[PDB]
Design a protein around this ligand. Structure first.
Ligand code: NI
Ligand code: NI
Lengths: 407, 408
């Protein structure tokens, strides 16, 4: 590590003695130049406070599992599915069955053994090739309902170096995929098929082009308000600040064709550590649905954490529609399934998150707790039912089955 | 155990959404507007500003971080951490709470007596506003070439009621009597370049009009100038709401604080809602000048804003953080040795699995990216390592932080 020794910036205040590092910043461009500048005029998300739960989709079983050093065994997968069901999740990603025999086997097992509750819709991932799309539908044979999630990469970079293809050609991959899904659904009546499309690497894709591909896919699928389509907009790489994600989401929500037949879905990764914020801002921008994992498992920096998002609603008086009353049981099961720890400082579930080491903070917390008890008596009430008013502790640890520890 | 929510759906909930009401006691918690106040900011500008320079960084690892540890830093571990922060490029370094902690007092004496403080570094000390605590704080720093004395008192609606059982005027007088005492003490210790920092502690639970009033009053006592500014540090003591509302509050303060060109507006965002990084970046775009955090987000409970993520979030979009992160492994080894707590596998930039790809499709795309770069390098008689980084799925060249891509 070499102490930066370059000169200060032109106009750097004299009280800031920081120096230029020799890091190769020239290999990297501001988001506006790497992709495009902000399309969004008259944004409204900064003025909208979340007042309801989104539709949650848990991707722990596929998008999560794919990220593991030690892949989930059949037993760990069933434990994860069971946990997700008991928590209250209604859409659950279960595999990439056309590319993974173990995914394929798991899908068959839950279908054939009657593991799927009537209000749960399994989700399967597929790429656009016709034979992979056929294998996806076959895996799901006998399912009473399923979401077939088809996708292809739309970014400026991937169009150039991966596909070596223009805009029309890349759009045709997606529309040809949708046409195949329509053909296959007709071949398999009696499963209620639902569709989800992602312009993968959406955050690296020009918005007008993202809207174009989605609109075209929608034309083929012909969704209706009663049989909507999911357009899921992934931050495949989280590329800039979460305000710009949210602006993009609002622009899409405002401008996509047939909007009232669209479930607008978010899938934010954490490359810049701001996945939760992108999700929360993006939800205020008009999204309908969020794809994440318990404790934010997923490749590299991971998926948006469903626990942090859920309890961020609860702690501001909004029902997440999910049972978080035993976070310890959630946490044990997750660590068992993923064979990877929940960090000590992880919001709501980490080892240290209901501890106070500071003496002043310990004093203040006791004042807060003693004053609540005093009020409980002066109202003839159970303190446990009263408005939580304790300095330093955003929630009563007992509402998630945890305990405050003065250390 | 865990039981499937079975309460009714919300009024208006679409029939495609089968979710039901849980028995979580949401009635015990109020929206932020009701718990504190609604947003004061009109015509916000932060949503339209992209960061184009590094903030003044302040590293609080040695006190605010150390306070969070299961196993307190020994003198050797503290020196190691201080050495890292210096070598990385940090110019303001919190070193202790010497009036509350004899082992802090000992560390502050050690660095001053032994001449450990680099010539471009200002040590930061924390104190509460009791006069005898303030006196002991200046005595701790006796001999220092320069120092920030950071005094604070809690200003939140909640703490006024249940902690201080006091009104607005009275809580403001705590802060101003604190300021007066610091002015008296600095006149008693010539030679040391004394600087001040004031925090309305629990600012996010405090009404903005009242946070401005207290800061303004403190400012009146200290009498800062553009040549001798004051730091007003605005902590999200508890992160209470979304990062846009924190940023709106910073912008409102930066607009409205008296004597703004003699103020260094500093951020201290915690991670209760998992949005500390966002709160810091949006808040910097709102007009802040300075950010207080720790390497790898160490700090009580969910911790402090991560300095590494904030720094690398600047580098990866073409802005020099003015900090050296060329060997992130070295930083991480030292952090884990000093804190005796791990960097998570998925921690941005530094975690074990951040330069890994398991997906077969991503692996293919990564190879295509890397192959096309080399053909462009060779095309232009350039070194591939000096060229614009263009690899699907990998925001930065792992080698720019001394790491390696691994296809697994
Ligand atoms: Ni993902
Ligand atoms: Ni802190």
């Amino acid at each position: 590590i070499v102490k930066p020794a370059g000169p200060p910036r032109v106009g750097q205040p004299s009280w800031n003695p920081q120096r230029a590092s020799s890091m190769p910043v020239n290999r990297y461009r501001p988001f506006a130049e790497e992709v495009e500048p902000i399309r969004l005029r008259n944004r409204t998300w900064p003025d909208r406070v979340i007042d309801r739960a989104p539709l949650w989709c848990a991707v722990d079983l596929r998008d999560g599992n794919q990220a593991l050093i030690d892949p989930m065994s059949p037993a760990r997968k069933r434990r994860m599915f069971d946990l997700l069901v008991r928590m209250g999740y209604k859409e659950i990603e279960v595999g990439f069955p056309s590319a993974s025999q173990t995914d394929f086997d798991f899908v068959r097992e839950i279908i054939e053994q009657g593991a799927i509750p009537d209000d749960v819709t399994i989700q399967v991932l597929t790429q656009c090739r016709p034979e992979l799309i056929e294998r996806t539908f076959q895996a799901c044979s006998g399912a009473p309902r399923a979401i077939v999630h088809f996708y292809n990469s739309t970014s400026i970079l991937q169009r150039r170096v991966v596909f070596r293809a223009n805009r029309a050609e890349v759009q045709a991959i997606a529309t040809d995929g949708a046409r195949k899904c329509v053909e296959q659904a007709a071949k398999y009546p009696g499963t209620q098929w639902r569709f989800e499309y992602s312009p993968e690497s959406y955050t690296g894709t020009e918005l007008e082009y993202a809207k174009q591909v989605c609109d075209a896919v929608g034309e083929v699928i012909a969704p209706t308000p009663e049989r909507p389509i999911i357009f899921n907009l992934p931050a495949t790489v989280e590329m800039t600040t979460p305000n710009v994600y949210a602006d993009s989401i609002e622009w899409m929500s405002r401008n996509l064709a047939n909007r009232e037949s669209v479930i607008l879905s978010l899938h934010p990764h954490n490359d810049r550590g701001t996945a939760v914020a992108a999700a929360e801002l993006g939800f205020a921008a008009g999204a309908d649905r969020i794809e994440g994992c318990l404790f934010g498992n997923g490749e590299r920096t991971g998926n948006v954490c469903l626990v942090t998002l859920g309890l961020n609603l609860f702690s501001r008086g909004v029902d997440p529609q999910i049972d978080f009353s035993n976070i310890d049981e959630i946490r044990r099961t997750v660590e068992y399934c993923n064979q990877l720890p929940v960090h000590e400082r992880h919001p709501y579930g980490g080892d240290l998150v209901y501890t106070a080491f500071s003496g002043s903070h310990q004093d203040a917390i006791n004042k807060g707790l003693d004053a609540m008890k005093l009020d409980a008596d002066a109202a003839d009430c159970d303190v446990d039912d009263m408005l939580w008013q304790v300095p330093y502790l955003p929630i009563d640890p007992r509402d998630v089955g945890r305990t405050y520890e003065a250390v």
